[PDB]
Write a protein that binds this DNA or RNA. Structure first.
Length: 158
RNA sequence: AAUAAAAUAUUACUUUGGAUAGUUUAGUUUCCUGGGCGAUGAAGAACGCAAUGAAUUGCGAUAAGUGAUAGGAACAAUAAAAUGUGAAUAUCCAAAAUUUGAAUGCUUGAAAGUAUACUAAGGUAUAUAUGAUAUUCAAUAUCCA
């Protein structure tokens, strides 16, 4: 599966990717939106606090039936959750993208999560047995996750 | 009044999905030649057989093949062994051809079985109906001593 975007300078970027990951797309789509643009060190700390329910992931688009929380103040979103499984899956991709950067020879402290994208994947079907002799579907919602870490520098064009 | 988180709109890239284009060892129809099955056991069914096979294909206790005749150097997924002193391959031929099935000694459900005769095992034959011939008979049915 190809990447949504290519780095501006491949010499100063690192990539990680996962395909058909067995994690919910709607939860991971909100976790990736939270960590997009922050430094790699901060993004690793934020995802660890989501795990122990100390920073919230604001559910901005998929907020149907989600409850309100005290950590959702100032984010322009009244709803949030702490998706642990999607935080752990992104953490394994963030790590893999850092040893890829270390192998290249980039300063890890200067990296940032420039591009992270979540895509839908083919669902797996199961059986749920309903009343009056019916059978419904019990479908997973896997996803693809891309990740590009690029170094940061000041931009000036005269 | 204000924010653009959600919402909406366009383009590029990616994804879910498999339309479109190109293609065809498959079909459909018409015509030509035959229309060549079986008690010498058919069609159908079952089971079994490959060095590593489950299906399918081929084959039948001589098993993915035997002989003969043509044929001339391969097979392969891997390893063997054989091979111009003849490998693949082909056949209206020869041998061989498990259990059934018209199924036919008797029984048969998913049944394992079993009788007699001929030639301990193994192999043959013994259903019903029927034509011809031979042989043994039955009925005073007609004569008849």
């Amino acid at each position: 599966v190809k990447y949504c975007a290519k780095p501006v300078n491949v010499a100063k970027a690192a990539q990680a990717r996962g395909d058909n990951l067995k994690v919910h797309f709607k939860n991971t789509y909100e976790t990736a939106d939270a960590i997009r643009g922050m430094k790699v060190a901060r993004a690793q700390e934020f995802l660890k606090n989501v795990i122990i329910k100390k920073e919230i992931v604001p559910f901005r688009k998929h907020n149907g039936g989600v409850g309100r929380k005290a950590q959702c103040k100032g984010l322009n979103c009244a709803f949030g959750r702490w998706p642990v499984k999607s935080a752990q899956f992104i953490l394994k991709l963030l790590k893999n993208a850092v040893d890829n950067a270390k192998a290249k020879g980039l300063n890890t402290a200067l990296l940032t999560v420039s591009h992270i994208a979540v895509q839908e994947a083919r669902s797996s079907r199961r059986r749920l047995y309903r009343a009056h002799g019916s059978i419904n579907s019990f479908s997973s919602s896997p996803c693809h996750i891309e990740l590009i870490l690029t170094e940061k520098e000041k931009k000036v064009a005269k």
